[PDB]
Each structure stands twice: as C-alpha cells, then as structure tokens.
Amino acid sequence: KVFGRCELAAAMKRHGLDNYRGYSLGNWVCAAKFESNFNTQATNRNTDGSTDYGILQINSRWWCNDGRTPGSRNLCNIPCSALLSSDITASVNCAKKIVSDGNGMNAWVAWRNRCKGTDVQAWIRGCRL
C-alpha cells in the first residue's frame, strides 16, 4: 500500500507513536517519507547482505528474520515479510523496540540526515488528527 501523508499520520497516532519516547508525530512521518516514500512494500539490499523492509526500512541483521542473513538476530521475533503488510501494526511495534534501545531515532539514517533539526511539524500540518 502507498499511504498518503495524513492517512499515515492518523494510523501512526492511533498505534501510539505520537510523542513515543519524546518524538513528536512529525518525526515519524518524515522518517517514513524518506525511508520508503510511504510504500509498505519497499525493500533495499545492503552491502553486508542484510535487507531493509517496509515503511520504516527495518533491517534483517538485527530485527527480523528473512532466512538469508546469516549472523542475524531476530529481536522483534517476526519474519521480515510481516513488515511489508498494508497493516502497519507489526512495523510500529518493532519500531518502538528499536527507538528504545538507547540511540533513539538515530537508528534511521534518513531521519538523521533529512529530518533531525528541521521543522518536522510541517509533516502533519493540514491533517485532521
């Protein structure tokens, strides 16, 4: 599924992400825009043989099992295919574990380079929430 901007903001808010560990809703929408262009089916392979999955590009070396990343943990205890569903619930639950692990949203490279320090509230302006 390819979400619209306000559609995703509302789904993320309903799943408990607004101000989760101090990160306002705009941060999460901005991160999804630049990681996946709001597409739940996005995948991208990395040099080390791991693959990133879904709306928040969650990585197979640490967080999900895809059966082809040898030395990998499966810390969210899900198959990586579950992160490509049009229901974002599995992605959100796993994102909450990642952002709590000490490094906050710096785990998402696009957030660090394209959202951090910017006016992220712009990403939810105009939306009925």
Ligand SMILES: [Cl-]
């Ligand atoms: Cl915000």
Ligand SMILES: [Cl-]
């Ligand atoms: Cl933090």
Ligand code: NA
């Ligand atoms: Na894994």
